[PDB]
RNA sequence: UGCUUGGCGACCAUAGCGUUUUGGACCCACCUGACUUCCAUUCCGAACUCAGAAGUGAAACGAAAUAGCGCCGAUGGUAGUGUGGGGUUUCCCCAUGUGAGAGUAGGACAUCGCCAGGCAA
RNA sequence: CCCCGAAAGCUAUUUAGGUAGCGCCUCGGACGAAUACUACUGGGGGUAGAGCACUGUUAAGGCUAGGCAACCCUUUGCAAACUCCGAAUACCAGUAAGUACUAUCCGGGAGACACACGGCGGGUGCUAACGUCCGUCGUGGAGAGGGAAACAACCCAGACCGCCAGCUAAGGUCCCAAAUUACUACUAAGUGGGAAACGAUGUGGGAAGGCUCAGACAGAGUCGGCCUGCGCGGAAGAUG
RNA sequence: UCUCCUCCCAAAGCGUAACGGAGGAGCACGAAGGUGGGCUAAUCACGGUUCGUGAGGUUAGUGCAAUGGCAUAAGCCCGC
RNA sequence: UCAACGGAUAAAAGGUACUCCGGGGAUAACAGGCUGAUACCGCCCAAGAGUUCAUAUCGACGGCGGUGUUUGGCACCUCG
């Protein structure tokens, strides 16, 4: 329900095509970008997808 | 110093071309099979090659009915 | 046996008229008695129904198993299912050859305005 | 290789439209002349049609 | 025989090897009305006495602190090596 | 040398050998030799080992082979180029994991056995234990 | 109100078979008769069919009982596997997610609707 | 100079190093979330695995028709073209949030249709090849920078330009060469810094066992297995 | 070898290559099609100069490969 | 049976060491490279042979490596 911050901490060249497009979903952009996101079910399971690559604050 | 082998047929596409709870309209072809792999239930017709069709608009339903049970595509009304 | 070898001759039909989703007129016929059942599309639940062991048809008829008593039964149930408003049935020979008794209460059911 | 020894025929209209319907027959099995109840599109109805040559 | 039997908090596959790698095995108690317990058991322990015949008529589990006489039901050995990777008790 | 008898198919693709043996308890005998590694026992190899334990039990109790080579292999033949299809079946393997109980032997002593496998263990081509009847 | 039977269904083995026992009030079944011929036999009234009702529940059928056989079936573990890492890389491991098949404990001799009949309320 | 940016595929071809349509690029126009990602819901699976109920194949024993042995029974394995079963994933569809100029359609212009390696699933091959043929993902192609001595295709990571600023990735921190100290172990083999079966009182740890002050082992310990860490031999090539 | 069909390879949607593994087709049928009615296999056991009864349950059948189907048969017989 | 099966013509076989041109290291012959089935060398087990006795010498049935070293595989370099 509340914002949580995610941080991309490694690259996503040569990551797997849905990874790279749920980075997108996310919005995140670039290594050491943040972005705020509303805390959801949708956005726990992209962040899932993409653990290795991104850091959550909560 | 050969192979008698070489051959085979075109692959024919069949399968299930709408699955459950899909939004058909009539006439569309749900299964291209080989015999009765699936049955013909409620609102689905059968080709003269076991294509299941759909005879009405609606949702297509899987269903195991009867005494062997068979599978069945229906057409739910919705 | 004779009883599943009857309902195998019956299924195909059965089977029709219920993807036909139409109102079955189902007749059973036994050595003795005769009986005639008219069921809904859901093949569930019965609208109208007459047999030789009602009362009213035994008392009527003089022996149960005759193809006049078959023509009883024939008028009962078309009579009975008119009043139910069931118009139009298909007619459920349940094994049966449609001959004599079965095919005497299908004419019967005929005369008192069932369609089929 | 080609193994099809069935004959192909025309079977025409016994009224005189001339329409034909086509088909095989095999000649051992049909020495005769094929004769069969047949819609006819030009005058709209069902009459006997005959076997002719191609 | 009595054995010290620790009742398993975490299960599945990662759960189980992590004990294995630890010189422990999971394990599982069934049997009577109550529900089956899963059980950490110490390998060697138990691996010293199924020598014995003893062992197969029945040894006692302290688990929970609760002594529970159990026979040995099923065991599932390594494909090779002399080790035991899970087994099953029945409450007797 | 075993091979089957007949066959539905002549010759049968190469695959992949993963997992463990599912025959894994010495269930006819007493005393088995265990396979510790994975591979392929040809037919030929399979022979070498059984005579080798039925000469030393010098015919004294049982013995079961628990392996069937029915795997054909296929090899080119030597200065044919690639293709022109699928080789020439030369000889059948036993497709081995780690676990599978190969043979077993009964009605010997186990010291009699545990020599008797050891010279069987020596002609085949992975690691294999000696392994005990157990309960 | 039961308790039964008959018909038509739901459901399609936890429901099934097998075995045993039981039932004729009705019903059901077997049954009786069929040059006289409605109808029937690629022969036969076996079946189908018709006209019946003396007999009998023998068979069948229904029901009950029976884990005997099938069936169902955890928990736990195991296998595999998506993602990311690692290796000793023909094959594996680790983190995380998922998680069988087999087997074990056990379950189980179904549950339900509409209509009609008999008995009994 | 600025912006975007492929393909080495499919189908067909007297075609195979050509070409055509399609796929992929671009430009214009239309259209606007219909798209992608995720959660949830609904689907169909017959793959991995597994199993032996079928079809085959296999071992032992029983029982026995037959003439030793069917067929059955018990036990035991195997399967790309077996299945009583059966995932993960993937795909199809729906619902929903957030993020994104996405998807689609109609036109102008192409280029390409020799691919490579690497991972994963496979066929072929010898589970040989910097081999070959597919599937799928990555990189190269068309990609600089850092690492891997040097090294398209591996690891990290995507270069608008300038800066004698700072933080980190992979990888590193004795000297070449930028950067490390403390502590605890193990190894003695320059193992590290090529190579297996197997051999061997090398050595470290762990959990048991046997035998022994009624005397073990060759007057106090001793013997042998098991689970393990690290080492030894096995180990021969041509300019240095 | 060249087109077509079936299976496998093919990685549980579709599709997917090799001078990869295996087989088939280049028709047949005026009924072997339509429909109404009917019917239900294989193989054994046992008794009889094909017949009867039982077991069994489709192991049969399908004009012709393989695969998927098929008892309400799509299999078998007959009338029109 | 346009079956070379999207079907160049209605209608078509060969030779060239007498040869020619345009190309290709897209593709063979030499040598290099990769690989190591094969080969060669070594080793493991020890059936046995060896009067007796596995191991003086030899080493069946099988097994594991090394070399690049035979026979091969591949087509990476080179066909201005």
Not at chain 1, 35 to 56: A, F, S
Not at chain 3, 5 to 25: F, N, P
Not at chain 6, 91 to 99: D, L, N, S, T
Request: charged share 30%; net charge positive.
């Amino acid at each position: 329900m509340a914002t949580i911050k995610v941080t991309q901490t490694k690259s996503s060249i040569g990551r797997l095509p849905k990874h790279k497009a749920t980075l997108r979903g996310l919005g995140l952009r670039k290594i050491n970008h943040t972005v705020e996101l509303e805390d959801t079910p949708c956005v726990r399971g992209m962040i899932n997808k993409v653990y290795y690559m991104v850091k959550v604050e909560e | 110093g050969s192979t008698r082998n070489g051959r085979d047929s075109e692959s024919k596409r069949l399968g299930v071309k709408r699955f459950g709870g899909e939004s058909v309209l009539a006439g569309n072809i749900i299964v291209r099979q080989r015999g009765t792999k699936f049955h013909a239930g409620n609102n689905v017709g059968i080709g003269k090659d076991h294509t299941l069709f759909a005879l009405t608009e609606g949702k297509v339903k899987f269903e195991v009915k009867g005494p062997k049970n068979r599978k069945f595509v229906s057409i739910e009304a919705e | 046996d004779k009883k599943a070898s009857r309902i195998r001759r019956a299924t195909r039909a059965r089977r029709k008229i219920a993807e036909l989703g139409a109102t079955r007129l189902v007749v059973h016929r036994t050595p003795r008695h005769v009986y005639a059942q008219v069921i809904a599309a859901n093949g569930s639940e019965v609208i109208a129904a007459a047999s030789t062991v009602e009362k009213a048809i035994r008392e009527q008829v003089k022996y149960t198993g005759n193809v006049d008593a078959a023509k009883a039964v024939g008028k009962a149930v078309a009579e009975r299912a008119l009043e139910k408003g069931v118009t139009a049935v298909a007619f459920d020979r349940s094994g049966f050859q449609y001959h004599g008794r079965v095919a005497a209460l299908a004419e019967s059911a005929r005369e008192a305005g069932l369609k089929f | 290789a080609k193994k099809g020894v069935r004959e192909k025929i025309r079977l025409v209209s016994s009224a005189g439209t001339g329409h034909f319907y086509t088909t095989d027959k095999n000649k051992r099995n049909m020495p005769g002349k094929f004769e069969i109840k047949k819609f006819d599109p030009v005058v709209r109805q069902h009459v006997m049609y005959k076997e002719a040559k191609i | 025989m009595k054995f010290e039997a620790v009742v398993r908090t975490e299960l599945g596959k990662g759960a189980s090897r992590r004990l294995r790698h630890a010189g422990k095995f999971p394990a599982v108690v069934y049997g009577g009305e109550e529900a089956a317990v899963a059980i950490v058991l110490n390998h060697d322990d138990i691996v010293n006495q199924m020598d014995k015949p003893e062992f197969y008529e029945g040894i006692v589990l302290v688990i929970d602190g609760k002594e529970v006489s159990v026979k040995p039901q099923d065991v599932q050995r390594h494909a090779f090596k002399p080790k035991v990777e899970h087994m099953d008790f029945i409450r007797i | 040398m075993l091979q089957p008898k007949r066959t539905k198919f002549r010759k049968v693709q190469t695959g992949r050998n993963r997992g463990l043996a599912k025959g894994t308890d010495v269930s006819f005998g007493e005393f088995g030799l265990k396979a510790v590694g994975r591979g392929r026992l040809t037919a030929r190899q399979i022979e070498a080992a059984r005579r080798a334990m039925t000469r030393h039990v010098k015919r004294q109790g049982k013995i079961w082979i628990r392996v069937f080579p029915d795997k054909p292999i296929t090899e080119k033949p030597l200065e044919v180029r690639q293709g022109k299809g699928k080789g020439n079946v030369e000889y059948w393997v036993a497709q081995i994991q780690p676990g599978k109980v190969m043979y077993e032997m009964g009605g010997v002593p186990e010291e009699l056995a545990r020599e008797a496998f050891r010279l069987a263990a020596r002609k085949l081509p992975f690691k294999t234990t000696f392994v005990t009847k157990q309960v």
